[PDB]
Task: structure prediction
Amino acid sequence: HLHDIRDLHRYYSSESFEYSNVSGKVENYNGSNVVRFNPQNHQLFLLGKDKEQYKEGLQGQNVFVVQELIDPNGRLSTVGGVTKKNNKTSETNTPLFVNKVNGEDLDASIDSFLIQKEEISLKELDFKIRQQLVNNYGLYKGTSKYGKIIINLKDENKVEIDLGDKLQFERMGDVLNSKDIRGISVTINQI
Amino acid sequence: HDIRDLHRYYSSESFEYSNVSGKVENYNGSNVVRFNPKDQNHQLFLLGKDKEQYKEGLQGQNVFVVQELIDPNGRLSTVGGVTKKNNKTSETNTPLFVNKVNGEDLDASIDSFLIQKEEISLKELDFKIRQQLVNNYGLYKGTSKYGKIIINLKDENKVEIDLGDKLQFERMGDVLNSKDIRGISVTINQI
Result:
């Protein structure tokens, strides 16, 4: 897990790409499973719920990509972010709350969050949400670092994400039906 | 304001009467409208936005009631809470996020809020949320007192209510369009 406010800031401010028609075989890279592709050369770690679902490879999927590192051979490595295609360009605006506790004060704000697909990886959800927090709510700046992103799916399940560190690599493979996302409430608990 | 009084008030029984009618009048300073369904004489203080809107009294509209007191003459007094008339049963479900901030700890739940009618006074919205919280989220019990209810309205206006005290009498006449309620997110800043 990545601690340190400055490190969190840079990563969640970085550039992201989204690719379609991504197919690769499958290959073992010291332990975890991988998929190389070249639209610049690329490497995709399946080590989560995608380890299960893409256990032999990718046929034509979409991949949300955030650059973790360039490995020794020169590959853009990235974890998770795999969605289906056929993956409709469905589109849903969803209520966003940012609740900024600062000891005894509370600066609450309302926004919305535009998911642009029928299916969205928890990786992409997490990235886009925090990038919005970084840009408009001063997340990972001064005293804004700890807190949670909370996602309500069809009024029954919950998805917590601790803002204190990077989304865990294991749950980057998770996928959500956009439709089901009812809202998002973030609560930054200030130092 | 004391936490046990807030507990009592927001733990109390509500009524919503149909077809309420009466002329406006007197009572020391403030406008009121005396009405009465079977066997219990009511007195409705119009001391806010409803002071202007309903300055010639009450045709057939509905009235959300919460007993503030029983006045010297025996009339059960109540402030605000007037909705439109018909006022159909169009049913909206609307997401509810509860966030309990206990120092460095943060416990967030997800839930749903069932609004039954097409319009709804702020008074009724305020009461129904707080009651749910008092019944399911240990509000007004122990260290749970301060915080805010933040309602998100049709893309995208905000309404804050402070949990630290009873809803200001002067806003009880405010009314919301039920469909436009995107979602509520309450934060309890624990002591």
